[PDB]
Design a protein around this motif. Structure first.
Motif, PDB file in Angstrom:
ATOM      1  N   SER B 106       0.830  -1.193   0.000  1.00 14.33           N
ATOM      2  CA  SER B 106       0.000   0.000   0.000  1.00 14.33           C
ATOM      3  C   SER B 106       0.871   1.251   0.000  1.00 14.33           C
ATOM      4  CB  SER B 106      -0.942  -0.002   1.202  1.00 14.33           C
ATOM      5  OG  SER B 106      -0.213   0.134   2.406  1.00 14.33           O
ATOM      6  N   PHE B 108       0.995   3.147   2.540  1.00  7.54           N
ATOM      7  CA  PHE B 108       1.430   3.300   3.919  1.00  7.54           C
ATOM      8  C   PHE B 108       2.476   2.267   4.324  1.00  7.54           C
ATOM      9  CE2 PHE B 108      -1.665   6.415   5.642  1.00  7.54           C
ATOM     10  CZ  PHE B 108      -2.492   6.529   4.547  1.00  7.54           C
ATOM     11  N   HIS B 109       2.972   1.470   3.383  1.00  3.07           N
ATOM     12  CA  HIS B 109       4.075   0.552   3.616  1.00  3.07           C
ATOM     13  C   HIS B 109       5.371   1.135   3.058  1.00  3.07           C
ATOM     14  CE1 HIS B 109       0.730  -2.192   4.308  1.00  3.07           C
ATOM     15  NE2 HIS B 109       1.573  -3.096   4.769  1.00  3.07           N
ATOM     16  N   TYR B 215       5.381  -0.975   8.812  1.00  4.88           N
ATOM     17  CA  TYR B 215       4.014  -0.497   8.670  1.00  4.88           C
ATOM     18  C   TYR B 215       3.410  -0.379  10.061  1.00  4.88           C
ATOM     19  CZ  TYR B 215       3.325  -5.536   9.035  1.00  4.88           C
ATOM     20  OH  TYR B 215       3.374  -6.848   9.436  1.00  4.88           O
ATOM     21  N   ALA B 219      -2.571  -2.486   9.371  1.00  4.29           N
ATOM     22  CA  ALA B 219      -2.396  -2.699   7.945  1.00  4.29           C
ATOM     23  C   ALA B 219      -2.117  -4.173   7.665  1.00  4.29           C
ATOM     24  CB  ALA B 219      -1.265  -1.824   7.411  1.00  4.29           C
ATOM     25  N   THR B 220      -2.137  -4.528   6.384  1.00  2.00           N
ATOM     26  CA  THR B 220      -1.980  -5.917   5.976  1.00  2.00           C
ATOM     27  C   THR B 220      -0.559  -6.405   6.239  1.00  2.00           C
ATOM     28  OG1 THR B 220      -3.679  -5.616   4.286  1.00  2.00           O
ATOM     29  CG2 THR B 220      -2.251  -7.539   4.089  1.00  2.00           C
TER      30      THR B 220
END
Lengths: 50, 245
Positions: B106, B108-109, B215, B219-220
């Motif tokens: 993403s 955000f990573h 992260y 999140a994932t």
């Protein structure tokens, strides 16, 4: 003096050496040519006579 | 444009929307062997579309403490499809490659990957720790197969050679801020026109995370890494029965 036919036509005295083979230059190895398949009768290069 | 790309060869296609151009190994495209450079006399085979296609080998997980992995070529393909069958049935081999690495996250990573191609990547051992022991890498380490193998000392690349100079080899970066894929095109690299596909490995592929993945919680957490590759201009010669290894 040569008067008889067997002396006139004689082959005695031929000092030159009949050569069946001759020398050819070969600076490198021999190249390979492209070949394809062959399916026919009468022409066989695989069979020999040693 | 430049960030979007589509690679099509054979009956396969790869599309991407976050590309970073294409790297051509040593500025040279893969090519066939010429008549002045060939040494064997029999006619080689060129199967064309049945072997020149994209093969997806496996998927690896990227974590916060991962060290890296390497793959050996063409050991990854010696047992996959028609290419594997031809490599087993024939004595000689000659081809290039087109490598695509997939890794997406993403916005955000964060994190960075170094993808490089090192020819004749001989793997050294730790020599028993102290260094008085004459050890050699085992089979699972020298020829890991299509499953890859994990680095133990990524700072030395398991060979006593610094990773800071790995960029002299054909390489690309996977920086999650910018791109999500990498492509390197490798011609045939060898000192012989043809070589065995089973005994000899031409090069190795290195994927080492230089910047750690990070992260925020929520999140994932599962970020996979995928390897896709396609042989190019493949030739084979010296046909006999098949050999397993």
């Amino acid at each position: 003096g040569d008067r008889v036919a067997d002396v006139i036509e004689s082959s005695i005295g031929d000092s030159v050496s009949r050569a069946l083979t001759r020398a050819l230059p070969a600076p490198t190895g021999q190249d390979t040519q492209v070949s394809s398949h062959r399916l026919d009768t009468g022409k066989v290069p695989a069979l020999q006579a040693a | 444009s430049d960030r979007v790309a589509q690679l099509t060869i054979g009956n396969s296609t790869i599309t991407t929307q976050e590309a970073a151009n294409i790297i051509v190994g040593y500025g040279e495209w893969p090519s066939y062997c010429s008549d002045s450079d060939a040494t064997a006399v029999d006619k080689p085979t060129r199967p064309d579309v049945s072997v020149n296609r994209f093969y997806t080998l496996d998927t690896k997980l990227w974590e916060k403490s991962s060290k890296g992995w390497y793959w050996k070529f063409p050991d990854v393909l010696t047992e996959t499809g028609v290419f594997g069958q031809n490599a087993q049935f024939h004595y000689l081999y000659r081809s290039g490659f087109c490598i695509h690495v997939q890794c997406n996250a993403s916005k955000f990573h964060q994190g960075a990957l170094l993808v490089a191609v090192l020819p004749e990547y001989v793997i050294g051992s730790v020599a028993g720790g102290t260094g008085t022991e004459d050890t050699h890498p085992p089979y699972k380490q020298t020829q890991p197969g299509a499953d890859g193998f994990e680095l133990q000392h990524p700072y030395v690349l398991d060979a006593g050679i610094p990773i800071s100079q790995l960029t002299v080899c054909p390489h690309q970066w996977i920086n999650l801020r910018t791109n999500n894929c990498a492509t390197i095109i490798v011609p045939y690299i060898n000192a012989l026109p043809f070589d065995s596909a089973l005994n000899h490995c031409n090069f190795g592929l290195l994927v080492v995370p230089i910047s750690p993945l990070d992260y925020d919680q929520g999140a994932t957490p599962v970020i996979p890494i995928t390897i896709t590759l396609a042989p190019m201009c493949s030739e084979f010669a010296g046909l006999r029965q098949a050999v397993t290894q």
